[PDB]
Design an enzyme around this catalytic site. Structure first.
Site, PDB file in Angstrom:
ATOM      1  N   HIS A 116       1.039  -1.303   0.040  1.00  0.00           N
ATOM      2  CA  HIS A 116       0.004   0.540  -0.112  1.00  0.00           C
ATOM      3  C   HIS A 116       1.109   1.585  -0.458  1.00  0.00           C
ATOM      4  O   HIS A 116       1.591   1.002   0.480  1.00  0.00           O
ATOM      5  CB  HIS A 116      -0.978  -0.043   0.869  1.00  0.00           C
ATOM      6  CG  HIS A 116       0.077  -0.007   2.479  1.00  0.00           C
ATOM      7  ND1 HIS A 116       0.013   0.936   3.399  1.00  0.00           N
ATOM      8  CD2 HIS A 116       0.804  -0.733   3.249  1.00  0.00           C
ATOM      9  CE1 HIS A 116       0.552   0.762   4.390  1.00  0.00           C
ATOM     10  NE2 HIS A 116       0.300  -0.069   4.364  1.00  0.00           N
ATOM     11  N   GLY A 140      20.624  -8.795  -6.134  1.00  0.00           N
ATOM     12  CA  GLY A 140      19.778  -9.374  -5.390  1.00  0.00           C
ATOM     13  C   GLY A 140      19.792 -10.072  -4.325  1.00  0.00           C
ATOM     14  O   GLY A 140      20.591 -10.213  -3.858  1.00  0.00           O
TER      15      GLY A 140
END
Lengths: 184, 184, 184
Positions: free
Chosen positions: C114, C162
């Site tokens: 959100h 990564g």
């Protein structure tokens, strides 16, 4: 029988609203006495406040439902406590014989493998994975993209940091951290 | 043409049962001669035992099917060996031109990017990700939430630990570990 | 109103073709003047080239659509710029009030929590997760299985490796690395 409206107590509130609407609730009433007894949910990410509010709402004759996204896949042999304020976000998978206790948050894409027990009011963050036969204590927090290897137990009130991999049994509460990204 | 019943040889067994039922199998018969020839699956997480049992079952005239959850997304141009005892769990994604060999396990939410090759009887754990053009050898294990960067090869019989990120080509077998969570 | 055919400019091309066909496109025309004005997409993983090609194609009167897999879950209150060459891969989740800008790539199983903002022409790799209220600058790269903790901002033109977990605000561009797997 779920009601057509739901009270959401509690950002995290709009997210819970999305899950409620996904389930088929037609209207969400945000809160943060004599009201109609619609289903209730507690949209508070914080374990301690969630539990307190849970106790208060339950004592005033309200049903605190589980909000479970239609995309959450739950084994028929898994146990999810009914009407227990559990949040299960999209793309969560809960495998055979795993048990989810009251007030737990299973956030987006978390995975609970076979025979796990996830203790009451724990918070399993986005992408966190529990391997087979893992026991998570009450009031634990597992951070984003964290994981717990097979057959391990994590004591009540513990914290596993973002990106961290738990590798040993922990029968005493603690804080278990991962390695942060380093500027080059 | 899949049969209505399936023998499951082999925790991991109940999970495979869930995938079988998801596919449309009506009944699962657990095993751990003159039986009816229903489809067979080998629900053994261990690569070496899985292969041995695979060979024995195949030599007794049984079809060892793939169990592929309906939520696994497989590119039309990907190659998945047919009737090869491959397990593909929920929310796995296999992208264009990737190749999955016999006896592989692709566990929940693992991702196999375009043009990968996943060698026979390898085990790709929950949340493990292989980037584009990655070659995983036979009998490899990639641990939970592990990943392999683009264009890399991992030799046969290698182990990548939970949470670990493979960053270089490895043409010799080895064990490649990540950092464990540390108690503070 | 989407056209029945789509031009794909650009491995990554076949993957975009799969997403186009998933959406309902009947035919994909690969490219790498007087042509019919079918919808266009730029299947280039590289942020800088994608932007340049975006500008050129837009200046020649083509509509550069978004390719969004049907399994991508987008909150009704999220904002995804329309016809902006955004790629949203399978099992991506974008939560309430998050904003995705033009030319972004959200790769398979990435999660945008959100109130995030994902800056134009950024690349969020497979399994990368942004927690609530995270601001990703323009032209950023977040590597496979990386994550960014709540309320953090990452400056334009930055790289997160990564497996790496960003833990502090970064108002200056940089390269932020994780720990590589170690051979034992």
């Amino acid at each position: 029988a779920r009601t057509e409206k739901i009270y959401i107590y509690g950002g995290h509130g709009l997210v819970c609203e999305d899950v409620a609407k996904n389930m088929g609730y037609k209207e969400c009433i945000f809160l943060d006495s004599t009201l109609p007894k619609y289903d209730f949910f507690i949209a508070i990410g914080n374990n301690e406040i969630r539990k307190k509010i849970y106790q208060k709402i339950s004592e005033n004759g309200f049903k605190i439902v589980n909000l479970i996204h239609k995309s959450a896949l739950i084994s028929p042999s898994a146990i999810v406590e009914e009407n227990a304020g559990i949040l299960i976000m999209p793309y969560v998978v809960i495998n055979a014989k795993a048990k989810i206790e009251k007030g737990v948050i299973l956030n987006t894409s978390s995975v609970i493998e076979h025979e796990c027990v996830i203790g009451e009011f724990s918070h399993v963050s986005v992408g966190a994975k529990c391997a087979g036969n893992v026991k998570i204590g009450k009031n634990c927090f597992l951070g984003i993209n964290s994981c717990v290897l097979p057959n391990l137990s994590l004591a009540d009130d513990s914290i596993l940091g973002g990106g961290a991999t738990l590798v040993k049994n922990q029968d005493e509460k603690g804080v278990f951290v991962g390695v942060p990204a380093k500027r080059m």
